[PDB]
Scaffold this active site. Structure first.
Site, PDB file in Angstrom:
ATOM      1  N   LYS A  15       0.823  -1.209   0.000  1.00 59.19           N
ATOM      2  CA  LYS A  15       0.000   0.000   0.000  1.00 59.19           C
ATOM      3  C   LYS A  15       0.856   1.258   0.000  1.00 59.19           C
ATOM      4  O   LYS A  15       0.507   2.254  -0.639  1.00 59.19           O
ATOM      5  CB  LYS A  15      -0.940  -0.009   1.204  1.00 59.19           C
ATOM      6  CG  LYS A  15      -2.079  -1.013   1.097  1.00 59.19           C
ATOM      7  CD  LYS A  15      -3.126  -0.754   2.166  1.00 59.19           C
ATOM      8  CE  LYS A  15      -4.342  -1.646   1.976  1.00 59.19           C
ATOM      9  NZ  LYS A  15      -5.408  -1.333   2.966  1.00 59.19           N
ATOM     10  N   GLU A  62      -4.958  13.655   9.833  1.00 60.03           N
ATOM     11  CA  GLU A  62      -5.553  13.507   8.514  1.00 60.03           C
ATOM     12  C   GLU A  62      -6.814  14.353   8.423  1.00 60.03           C
ATOM     13  O   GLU A  62      -7.188  15.060   9.364  1.00 60.03           O
ATOM     14  CB  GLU A  62      -5.879  12.038   8.204  1.00 60.03           C
ATOM     15  CG  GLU A  62      -4.660  11.151   8.062  1.00 60.03           C
ATOM     16  CD  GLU A  62      -3.712  11.644   6.986  1.00 60.03           C
ATOM     17  OE1 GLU A  62      -4.197  12.171   5.960  1.00 60.03           O
ATOM     18  OE2 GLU A  62      -2.490  11.511   7.168  1.00 60.03           O
ATOM     19  N   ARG A  94      -7.626  -6.607 -11.184  1.00 64.22           N
ATOM     20  CA  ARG A  94      -8.281  -7.898 -11.346  1.00 64.22           C
ATOM     21  C   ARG A  94      -9.743  -7.660 -11.696  1.00 64.22           C
ATOM     22  O   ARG A  94     -10.351  -6.691 -11.229  1.00 64.22           O
ATOM     23  CB  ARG A  94      -8.170  -8.737 -10.070  1.00 64.22           C
ATOM     24  CG  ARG A  94      -8.695 -10.150 -10.187  1.00 64.22           C
ATOM     25  CD  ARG A  94      -9.054 -10.704  -8.820  1.00 64.22           C
ATOM     26  NE  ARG A  94     -10.113  -9.935  -8.171  1.00 64.22           N
ATOM     27  CZ  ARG A  94      -9.910  -9.038  -7.215  1.00 64.22           C
ATOM     28  NH1 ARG A  94      -8.695  -8.770  -6.765  1.00 64.22           N
ATOM     29  NH2 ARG A  94     -10.952  -8.392  -6.700  1.00 64.22           N
TER      30      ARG A  94
END
Ligand SMILES: O=CCCCC[C@@H]1SC[C@@H]2NC(=O)N[C@@H]21
Lengths: 678, 566
Positions: free
Chosen positions: A118, A202, A295
């Site tokens: 990530k 954040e 995918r």
């Protein structure tokens, strides 16, 4: 380019049949794969050839990528489609396929490896310039730094902590110009939750709704983004119901979602089909990147109902084979237009009343909803199982997918309702009742549902119809008749018949009594929960004389006196009676009455147990003192002229030894007392 | 009390007490036993192969069989010479004769295994079989007894083990009303052991007696004359409802070709002396004249067809049945069997064996709390109700009473019986003798012998002494006998006879160690020199020898064999 005539599939289930079908239209060969047994499964009955791979555990089956590649080489396979799961996300397997020379279907190995971590992925998107909401900025070096970037990097304040979900440092402090409470909140969070003193700030979003656009790319530098999607409804990170046309989404936004998505895919480089996922807050009005998947999703046929290319139906898997062909595209982003709305729902072989635990059992009767067009709506069902099949515990519980395309949302939602109702399965409890409850009472027909939408309405849901005393009457009657000639040819003297059934509904036994008056098998009565009435009953053809685990499936008719009439297809077994009709489906458990029928001994067993004859000389005792002995093991072995003659006592309860090995004992001595465990 | 079912559920469920749940844990003890068993079957299953295609084993790795090395080249030469003649030297005639897809039994096998000791000390007579092969065969929908004379004439046609095998086959066929088919190839007689085989009773004359007593009871019999049958062997073609003489090599003689010489020795061709004379001679001897082996076998089959037994067998034994397997794996049968050569008797169980063999792994116990030594109850074997007597421990008077009661019920309701033999186990206590134990033993033996029920016995192991008289024995007319590898048939005591006979044999008080070396070791050698492999079957004592794992199939063959009976 390279010709393809043989197609290989990795996984099993609905995707196997889907990949196999279109293949027929392209006129290409097919190959199937199956684990130990698993050979009666449908997909193998759909392919041209199938190969067994090995033991049921996923480590043993569908994970030996090297063995799969060697087998494919021996078969001279042209292409492999991994599908989703197993080796769907493994760059080593794709690289080995490329080295072997087979056209892998999907992204290159580099993209999969990069998106595996990530941190490096978010690094790549941050370099690309896509609006991304990060997880962290630096650390809590200074408390004044918190005020420095509080109004700087991210005005919304997400205090939280370095780790841990307690989040008491948050305090839902959405008010800026906060400087005397944020530091106090963080310092009180540090207490008893010290962890690491580093703190990350954040942006905090009050609301969250998930978005995910689709994309497609050839290998000749040309692509086009498909329509958006919504996955707001999910329980415990499991997809439940989704909508390809995000209701309440402005056209202009749709357009832009594409420009952002194409930038990210081009930056990493991409070939084939994929999906970018966003996270969105209505109050802010902006979307921030969360994750992408390299995918094909499971939700591909859903978005299809809301997109047409050059006025023709779109097939997502088709293009992926054509992408592997090396041919370039034929359409710009323009040729694709949306038409109407559609909704989807997944059915899981789990029990809603329980902890959504999967159950494995044979599939007795499977109703199939009308998969044809009628009115202003299209409804389809795709199932990876059929009649006579059995669910495997190793696999995930997944039966079928139902999709209701329509010209308007209303039509689509209304369509499903009826379809969801119509589809019926007998043998294993399902969540189909839950989904219908999720659709009727919740006013989500408006179209605004958050990510946590399921959490608040849990009280309202998890509700099923109440078993009326009448339902017991048809259910009880079926078990008799669907087992024997009860009430058939019966006869007594100057009296009348009687026969009773015991149901273990919930944790309370239920008794139902049935009897007749006159010379009529037809006229029948009932008395359950102190409620009495009359009805007549007319059966159908007698079937399933072998009365196996599936037992007997027959239709029934019941004319109750009030005036009604009913039709009930009852597959009854000793364990339970299942009745399906206009009421719905209900399975009633029969009161269990089993308990070592025979060996029911409460005798004290005080003395004179496993007594040995005169010679004695006990030795080699292999039983521990004070251990339960229900099965007749050799408690003591005594030898009389080479006569082991083991006693082999079967008295239940722990056995207490009063002798030791090698001790000569007299005739009929109390070697041990076999007493009930107290 | 809060319990009100209707018997089923309690019944017709996968949870009835009738079944049995002895599950093994595969521990060392299991391994020690399971492994040995494996050590007790490999060669059993092997020697069979060696006698099959006897003396010609091209692998030359038959060290698993303790059989001595034999001249393979001589046997191959003999077989080549015989097959060049035009006749099939093998049991091939049999599996050509029986319908494909059907069963077979091979009643007596390994017959005459290393029986006779020759003049050469290290050499035994090479009788790989008894000179014949015998098994139950199903021909054209008709169950029949098959007896085939092997072409081994090197030692001589028939021995004291050959005529006994033939007579056992004839008695079995007569008891069960299965027609016989004889495949005749002979070298005449054996003029060396002729006193042992020709005169007296139960000899070569009783074959002729049986072939007439059968036709009195209208049980048709068929013989095929592949080669010469002289020296009284020519009467079977004469005493036969149907007989077959092959066109070239089929010959029948009452006097040998050498015999015409020295008594009006006007020698002429062997054809004219009594062989196959296809020239429309005056003699109406021999029903079928077939040009080839296949033609003769085909005509034998065709004659077997026209007997009308197909309807009767099809009605009596249902051809279309659903097999019901036991609940536990039959490979586990070797494990519960203990080891061998153990100073003191090891432990043993029965429940597990019966639960492994019977249908659905079930049983119907009579009184088991009382006379806990002996086991008796009903069962199911492939669609047929059976009674089993299996022995476990030292017999008491009460065990004998229970056995008599069970046999009484079984005879009353016409239920077949199965026997699983074990130790003698007669207590010698003075109180037991004073309690009339002899009377109760007589009570048991009287019922055993008096029973008209068909009876089959199979050796579990350790059948030594007069105890078998309590359960069953060859002298009590068992229509079949079969054996497991770990069997010992001996005097009233296997181990104790050593101790008892040590005391009372011209022994001085001193020299104790040398005496026990000369007495106890010697009697142990004597009483375990006999065993399943040699003393039995080879001498047609308990003629059948089987594997413990495949017992239920064999017993089901036996029961289907004993329902054509009157
Ligand atoms: O408990 C001790 C008495 C054991 C009796 C065993 C019987 S007596 C006759 C026969 N011969 C043996 O060696 N065992 C049995």
């Amino acid at each position: 380019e390279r010709k393809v005539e043989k197609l290989l599939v990795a996984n099993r289930g609905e995707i196997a049949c889907r990949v196999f079908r279109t293949c027929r239209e392209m006129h290409i060969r097919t190959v199937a794969l199956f684990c130990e047994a698993e050979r009666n499964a449908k997909h193998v009955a759909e392919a041209d050839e199938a190969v067994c791979i090995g033991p049921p555990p996923a480590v043993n089956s569908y994970l030996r990528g090297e063995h799969i590649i060697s087998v494919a080489k021996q078969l001279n396979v042209d292409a492999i489609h991994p599908g989703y799961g197993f080796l769907s996300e493994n760059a080593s397997f794709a690289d080995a396929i490329t080295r072997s020379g087979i056209e892998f279907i999907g992204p290159p190995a580099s993209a999969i490896s990069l998106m595996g971590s990530k941190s490096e992925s978010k690094r790549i998107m941050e370099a690309a310039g896509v609006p991304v909401v990060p997880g962290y900025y630096g650390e809590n070096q200074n408390v004044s730094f918190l005020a420095e970037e509080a109004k700087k990097v991210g005005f919304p304040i997400l205090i939280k902590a370095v780790s841990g979900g307690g989040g008491k440092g948050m305090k839902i402090v959405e008010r800026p110009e906060d400087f005397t409470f944020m530091l106090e909140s963080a310092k009180r969070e540090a207490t008893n939750f010290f962890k690491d003193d580093r703190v990350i700030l954040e942006r905090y979003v009050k609301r969250s709704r998930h978005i995910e656009c689709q994309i497609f790319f050839d290998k000749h530098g040309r692509g086009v983004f498909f329509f958006e999607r919504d996955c707001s409804v999910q329980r415990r990170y499991q997809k439940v119901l989704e909508e390809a046309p995000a209701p309440h989404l402005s056209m202009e936004t749709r357009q832009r979602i594409g420009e952002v998505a194409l930038q990210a895919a081009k930056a990493v480089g991409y070939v084939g089909a994929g999906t970018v996922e966003f996270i969105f807050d209505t109050s802010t009005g902006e979307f921030y990147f969360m994750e992408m998947n390299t995918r094909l999703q499971v939700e591909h046929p859903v978005t299809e109902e809301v997109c047409r290319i050059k006025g023709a139906p779109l097939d997502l898997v088709k293009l992926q084979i054509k992408t592997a062909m090396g041919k370039p595209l034929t359409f710009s982003q323009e040729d694709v237009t949306l038409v109407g709305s559609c909704i989807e729902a997944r059915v899981y072989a789990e029990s809603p009343e329980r902890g959504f635990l999967p159950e494995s059992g044979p599939l007795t009767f499977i109703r199939e909803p009308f998969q044809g067009v009628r009115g202003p709506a299209r409804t389809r069902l795709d199932t990876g199982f059929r009649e006579g099949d059995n669910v495997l515990i190793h696999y995930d519980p997944m039966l079928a997918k139902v999709i209701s395309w329509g010209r308007s949302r209303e039509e689509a939602l209304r369509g499903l309702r009826q379809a969801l109702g119509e589809y019926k399965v007998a043998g294993i409890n399902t969540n189909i009742e839950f989904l219908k409850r999720c659709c009727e009472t919740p006013e989500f027909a408006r179209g605004g549902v958050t990510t946590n939408f399921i959490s608040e309405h849990e009280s309202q849901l998890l509700k099923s119809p109440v078993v009326t005393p009448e339902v017991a009457a048809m259910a009880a009657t079926a078990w008799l008749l669907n087992r024997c000639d009860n009430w058939r040819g019966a006869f007594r003297l100057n009296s009348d018949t009687n026969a009773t059934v015991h149901f273990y509904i919930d944790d309370h036994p239920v008794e139902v009594r049935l009897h007749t008056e006159g010379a009529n098998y037809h006229k029948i009565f009932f008395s359950v929960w102190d409620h009495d009435g009359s009805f007549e009953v007319c059966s159908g053809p007698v079937t399933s004389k072998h009365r196996d685990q599936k037992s007997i499936v027959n239709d029934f008719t019941f004319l109750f006196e009030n005036g009604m009439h009913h039709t009930v297809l009852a597959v009854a077994t000793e364990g339970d009676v299942t009745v399906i009709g206009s009421f719905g489906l209900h399975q009633l458990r029969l009161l269990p009455l089993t308990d070592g029928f025979g060996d029911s001994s409460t005798a004290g067993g005080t003395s004179t147990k496993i007594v040995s004859p005169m010679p004695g000389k006990v030795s080699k005792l292999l039983v521990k003192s004070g251990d339960l002995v229900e099965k007749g093991q050799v408690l003591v072995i005594v030898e009389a002229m080479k006569m082991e003659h083991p006693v082999r006592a079967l008295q239940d309860g722990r056995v207490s030894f009063l002798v030791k090995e090698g001790e000569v004992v007299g005739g009929d001595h109390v070697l041990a007392t076999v007493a009930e465990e107290e | 009390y809060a319990h009100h079912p209707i018997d089923y559920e309690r019944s017709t469920s996968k949870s009835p007490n009738i079944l049995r749940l002895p599950a093994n844990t595969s521990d060392p003890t299991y391994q020690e036993n399971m492994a040995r068993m494996e050590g007790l079957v490999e060669q059993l299953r092997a020697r069979v192969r060696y006698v099959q295609a006897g003396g010609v084993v091209p692998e030359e790795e038959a060290a698993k069989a303790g059989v001595s090395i034999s001249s393979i080249e001589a046997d191959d030469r003999v077989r080549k010479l015989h097959l060049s003649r035009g006749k099939m030297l093998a049991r091939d005639r049999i599996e050509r004769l029986i319908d494909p897809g059907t069963r077979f039994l091979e009643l007596s096998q390994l017959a005459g295994w290393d029986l006779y000791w020759d003049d050469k000390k290290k050499e035994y007579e090479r009788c790989y079989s008894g000179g014949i092969v015998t098994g139950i065969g199903l021909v054209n929908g008709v169950r029949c007894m098959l007896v085939a004379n092997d072409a081994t004439v090197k030692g001589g046609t028939y021995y004291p083990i050959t005529v006994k095998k033939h007579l056992r086959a004839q008695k079995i066929a007569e008891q069960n009303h299965l027609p016989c088919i004889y495949l005749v190839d002979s070298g005449g007689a054996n003029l060396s052991r002729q006193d042992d085989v020709f005169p007296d009773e139960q000899h070569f004359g009783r074959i002729f007696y049986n072939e007439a007593q059968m036709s009195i009871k209208s049980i048709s019999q068929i013989a095929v004359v592949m080669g010469s049958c002289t020296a009284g062997g020519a009467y079977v073609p004469a005493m036969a409802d149907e007989n077959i003489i092959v066109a070239r090599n089929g010959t029948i003689f009452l006097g040998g070709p050498p015999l015409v010489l020295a008594a009006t020795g006007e020698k002429v061709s062997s054809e004219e002396l009594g062989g196959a004379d296809v020239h429309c001679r005056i003699s109406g001897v021999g029903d079928h004249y077939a040009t080839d082996d296949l033609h003769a076998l085909y005509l034998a089959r065709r004659a077997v067809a026209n007997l009308n037994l197909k309807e009767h067998n099809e009605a009596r034994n249902p051809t279309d049945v659903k097999p019901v397997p036991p609940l536990y794996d039959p490979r586990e049968l070797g494990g519960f069997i203990p080891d061998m050569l153990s100073d003191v008797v090891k432990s043993f169980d029965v429940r597990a064996i019966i639960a492994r063999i019977v249908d659905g792994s079930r049983f119907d116990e009579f009184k088991a709390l009382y006379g806990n030594t002996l086991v008796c109850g009903f069962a199911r074997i492939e669609g047929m109700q059976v009674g089993i007597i299996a022995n476990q421990g030292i017999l008491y008077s009460e065990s004998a009473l229970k056995g008599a009661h069970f046999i009484g019920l079984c005879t009353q309701r016409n239920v077949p019986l199965l026997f699983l033999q074990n130790i003698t186990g007669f207590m010698v206590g003075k109180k037991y003798e004073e309690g009339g134990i002899a009377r109760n033993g007589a009570r048991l033996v009287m019922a055993v012998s008096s029973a008209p029920v068909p009876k089959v016995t199979v050796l579990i192991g350790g059948s030594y002494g007069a105890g078998n008289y309590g359960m069953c024995g060859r002298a009590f007319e068992p229509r079949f006998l079969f054996m497991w590898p770990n069997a010992r048939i001996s005097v009233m005591g296997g181990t104790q006879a050593a101790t008892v006979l040590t005391l009372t044999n011209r022994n001085l008080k001193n020299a104790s160690e040398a005496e026990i070396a000369a007495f106890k070791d010697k009697v142990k050698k004597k009483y375990e020199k006999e065993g399943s492999c040699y003393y039995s079957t080879a001498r047609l004592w308990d003629d059948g020898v089987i594997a413990p794992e495949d017992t239920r199939v064999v017993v089901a063959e036996a029961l289907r064999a004993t329902r054509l009976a009157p």
